[PDB]
Amino acid sequence: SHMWIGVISLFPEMFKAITEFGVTGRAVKHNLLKVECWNPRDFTFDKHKTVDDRPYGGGPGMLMMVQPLRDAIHTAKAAAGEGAKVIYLSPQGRKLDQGGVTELAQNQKLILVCGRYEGIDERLIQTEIDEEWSIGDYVLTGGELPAMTLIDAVARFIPGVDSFADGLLDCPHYTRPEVLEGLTVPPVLMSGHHEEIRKWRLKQSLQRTWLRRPELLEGLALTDEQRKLLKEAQAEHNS
Amino acid sequence: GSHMWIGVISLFPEMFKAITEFGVTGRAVKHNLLKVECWNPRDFTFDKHKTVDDRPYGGGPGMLMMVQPLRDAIHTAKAAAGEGAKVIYLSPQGRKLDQGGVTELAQNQKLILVCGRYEGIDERLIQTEIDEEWSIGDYVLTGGELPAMTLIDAVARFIPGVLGKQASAEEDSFADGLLDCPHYTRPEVLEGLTVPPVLMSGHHEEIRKWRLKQSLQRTWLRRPELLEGLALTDEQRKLLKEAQAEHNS
RNA sequence: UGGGAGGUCGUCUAACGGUAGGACGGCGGACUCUCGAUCCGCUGGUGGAGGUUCGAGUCCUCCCCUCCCAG
Ligand SMILES: Nc1ncnc2c1ncn2[C@@H]1O[C@H](C[C@@H](N)CC[C@H](N)C(=O)O)[C@@H](O)[C@H]1O
Ligand SMILES: Nc1ncnc2c1ncn2[C@@H]1O[C@H](C[C@@H](N)CC[C@H](N)C(=O)O)[C@@H](O)[C@H]1O
């Protein structure tokens, strides 16, 4: 099985950033992931290929023009066939987190609408969009980076391609040399005992989650081992 | 004129064309309002195999970035940037980015962004070369390039002259700490839905109040937590109260 | 529907008793853009009757509608 992602964007070339590079790029070459794009501009019918328009009530800025965007969405929705969910990238949507990523991952086909300018017509959101998703509480100039972020995150779940895995931040990592700028690698990682290492790393993940993002610890049911190790870390932090 | 410089450390510098050749950010670059320079650790690898990943102690998942190429790239960039440059590591273990953080980061004249790949980077490079760690969200990506581009884009909207003449009236979410109001454009009736008459009224004061009320109502219904510590005018309190009543009962 | 005040394009704002303008909106067009930028046309008004005056947005009367002050 593979993942198919439809994208509606005025700047499809931006998507090369994920399709021609890294793990996701490798995913594309092996046909494990396909990303098809439709450009509202290819759907205009005028001399200047207009894809934006003025918002009613005046004031500055522009919105994406309704017709080209709509036609692109219907065309993409068509090509996608039955069962394809249309998602609009927006700061007012559901904030992405690992749970949202896994849910989005269930879907076999998705179509991602990338806004530009001041956004899209509200009626298109009500009539064509199934779900709105935000990548964070901040505003960007467009939805392409958010779309690629979502794609990359879900792409990690495609067969043949873990922090947050258990609700915890990842542990610290080390590689050669044994000593770097007077800093030595914790002896336990070189001890070669898989069990001592596993326990040390788990304790570190727990300590970091507690110290940097302690709130990520309310919704979890720690195992006896996790509760014990966390208890130890808190004792070490301020004795 | 207004200018900002962003140094980037990345194995895939070409990814950055996504924010430098396109849109508002592309024009900002084309007008020298925003400058992005990229150093690639692969160009600093002694390894004859242009190898940039090394094995993690303890065995485990994946590979880590090789220390020497990454370190040399960071020192070269830091040296080129000169003094006063803040070094940031993109990582999910970092401070979660939000609009307040974007304004704060936007307070820097020079920044260097380190983009990880594979399982990440040696913790000691973080302790010795990194000033701050930032995450774009509670989810895991294959690399720091998208997060870096996200950070750059987010701060770029705040560089004067980027959006154009009087961007102070340009409306986006979080700009004033509230979510944006809904927007409408031509045609007047599509898929049975009509544009709210007030926006066609030409009545300026009512439109200002409508927009403000919509922003308050939408923020209240979708992200009420933002409303927890917000300085508000008498008018916003009144308008918000009207909206809360209107939906309830 | 008691006592005050007031009516000009859709909105805001001008005009001595002398040919009713401007800004924004709305419609449409140029930039030759990826311009969330900037320009340019077109649309459109004195609430209604009387009366004074050579002439009324302006002054007088009545009618209507609107705001403020206690139903
Ligand atoms: N936090 C975000 N998450 C996902 N997409 C975003 C985010 N911020 C901006 N975008 C995209 O950027 C496009 C252009 C934005 N300037 C529009 C913002 C819109 N006016 C709002 O505040 O809701 C939006 O249509 C979205 O597609
Ligand atoms: N949410 C995020 N915010 C910022 N950077 C991220 C995010 N997710 C992944 N990255 C970066 O992209 C790469 C992700 C992977 N290397 C895995 C990282 C590993 N889980 C860690 O704990 O660092 C690293 O460079 C991360 O710093």
Side-chain angles (χ1 to χ4, degrees):
Chain A
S1 70
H2 80 288
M3 194 63 194
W4 181 93
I5 308 285
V7 167
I8 307 306
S9 173
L10 292 172
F11 300 130
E13 292 266 314
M14 287 178 67
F15 290 84
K16 288 178 189 181
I18 62 173
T19 64
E20 300 189 339
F21 305 104
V23 161
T24 52
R26 278 198 278 283
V28 170
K29 180 46 190 66
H30 296 165
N31 276 273
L32 278 173
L33 170 65
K34 185 173 295 182
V35 159
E36 286 190 55
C37 300
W38 285 273
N39 186 340
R41 198 174 296 277
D42 298 327
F43 295 87
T44 59
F45 294 107
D46 68 311
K47 177 181 192 251
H48 299 290
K49 298 269 176 189
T50 305
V51 290
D52 65 7
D53 205 349
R54 300 210 78 227
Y56 282 119
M62 298 289 285
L63 292 181
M64 289 180 83
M65 223 181 80
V66 166
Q67 174 270 312
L69 173 59
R70 181 169 188 266
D71 287 24
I73 292 180
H74 287 287
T75 300
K77 204 173 168 175
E82 300 219 304
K85 176 170 288 185
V86 161
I87 284 174
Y88 174 46
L89 281 305
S90 154
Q92 321 217 12
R94 169 172 170 186
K95 182 189 306 178
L96 187 68
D97 57 25
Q98 207 53 37
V101 171
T102 65
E103 290 183 35
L104 288 160
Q106 296 308 121
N107 293 279
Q108 174 169 102
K109 305 171 271 175
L110 292 175
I111 291 169
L112 305 180
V113 179
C114 304
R116 277 275 161 171
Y117 320 124
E118 187 172 62
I120 50 165
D121 191 88
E122 197 61 25
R123 297 164 296 172
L124 281 177
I125 298 174
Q126 301 174 350
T127 63
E128 306 289 340
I129 304 306
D130 295 314
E131 300 177 305
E132 290 185 282
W133 287 81
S134 174
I135 61 167
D137 293 337
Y138 42 84
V139 178
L140 306 179
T141 61
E144 290 83 5
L145 288 169
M148 288 189 269
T149 297
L150 191 157
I151 299 179
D152 181 287
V154 300
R156 296 241 326 283
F157 285 25
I158 298 175
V161 170
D162 319 272
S163 174
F164 287 117
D166 306 335
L168 302 170
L169 297 186
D170 202 343
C171 56
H173 304 301
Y174 298 84
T175 186
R176 300 145 51 166
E178 176 184 359
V179 181
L180 180 62
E181 252 284 324
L183 298 202
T184 57
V185 174
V188 63
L189 302 175
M190 320 200 244
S191 76
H193 190 219
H194 43 297
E195 196 66 21
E196 317 173 55
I197 289 176
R198 181 184 71 77
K199 292 183 308 181
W200 181 86
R201 285 185 172 153
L202 179 47
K203 180 173 179 176
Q204 286 288 335
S205 321
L206 290 155
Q207 179 178 2
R208 289 156 75 82
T209 306
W210 170 56
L211 297 171
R212 300 177 186 183
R213 305 289 307 304
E215 77 278 11
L216 288 181
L217 276 181
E218 295 300 306
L220 305 178
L222 305 176
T223 62
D224 292 30
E225 175 178 57
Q226 296 172 10
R227 291 190 250 94
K228 172 178 227 174
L229 292 175
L230 174 59
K231 286 176 189 173
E232 285 179 39
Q234 295 174 326
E236 285 165 271
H237 166 284
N238 61 310
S239 187
Chain B
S2 76
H3 174 102
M4 194 173 289
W5 181 92
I6 307 291
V8 166
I9 307 304
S10 173
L11 292 172
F12 300 108
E14 292 310 312
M15 288 178 67
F16 290 80
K17 288 177 189 288
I19 81 171
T20 64
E21 300 188 339
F22 305 101
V24 161
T25 52
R27 295 199 306 283
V29 171
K30 180 159 168 303
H31 296 324
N32 249 284
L33 284 173
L34 171 64
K35 184 76 183 182
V36 181
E37 285 191 8
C38 300
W39 285 273
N40 185 341
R42 152 173 296 240
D43 297 327
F44 295 57
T45 58
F46 293 159
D47 207 291
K48 57 181 166 172
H49 300 290
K50 300 275 76 179
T51 276
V52 293
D53 65 318
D54 206 355
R55 300 180 77 194
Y57 283 116
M63 298 290 285
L64 292 209
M65 290 181 85
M66 189 163 141
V67 168
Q68 174 269 312
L70 172 58
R71 182 169 189 203
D72 287 356
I74 294 167
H75 287 298
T76 297
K78 179 136 67 174
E83 299 320 303
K86 177 170 288 184
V87 186
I88 290 162
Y89 174 45
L90 281 307
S91 155
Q93 274 89 35
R95 169 172 170 186
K96 183 156 55 178
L97 186 64
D98 57 25
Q99 207 54 37
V102 173
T103 65
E104 217 182 310
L105 288 164
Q107 297 282 59
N108 293 159
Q109 300 169 309
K110 275 171 190 297
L111 292 173
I112 290 171
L113 305 178
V114 179
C115 304
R117 277 275 161 171
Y118 318 128
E119 297 290 87
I121 74 179
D122 190 284
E123 197 61 25
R124 298 164 296 173
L125 281 210
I126 299 161
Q127 301 175 67
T128 63
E129 307 290 311
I130 304 301
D131 295 313
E132 301 177 4
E133 290 184 282
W134 287 81
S135 174
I136 60 166
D138 292 337
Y139 41 78
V140 178
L141 306 177
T142 64
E145 290 83 23
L146 288 171
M149 288 189 269
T150 297
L151 191 159
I152 296 169
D153 181 291
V155 302
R157 297 182 68 277
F158 283 172
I159 300 168
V162 170
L163 260 199
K165 230 77 167 67
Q166 315 311 84
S168 47
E170 303 271 5
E171 272 302 354
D172 271 277
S173 289
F174 311 115
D176 50 326
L178 302 172
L179 296 184
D180 203 7
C181 57
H183 303 301
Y184 298 85
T185 186
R186 300 53 186 165
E188 292 184 358
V189 183
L190 286 310
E191 290 242 30
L193 298 177
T194 62
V195 172
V198 65
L199 302 173
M200 320 276 244
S201 76
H203 191 329
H204 300 322
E205 179 66 3
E206 299 316 298
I207 288 181
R208 181 184 71 77
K209 292 184 273 181
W210 181 87
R211 286 185 196 292
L212 202 49
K213 179 173 179 176
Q214 286 305 328
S215 189
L216 289 154
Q217 179 178 294
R218 218 156 178 164
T219 305
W220 170 57
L221 297 145
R222 301 199 187 190
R223 306 290 306 276
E225 46 278 34
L226 288 179
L227 276 178
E228 295 176 351
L230 271 177
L232 304 175
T233 62
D234 291 87
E235 175 178 56
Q236 296 172 287
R237 291 190 180 51
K238 293 178 63 174
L239 281 171
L240 173 58
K241 228 177 286 174
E242 285 179 46
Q244 295 174 308
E246 286 165 38
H247 191 70
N248 283 167
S249 186

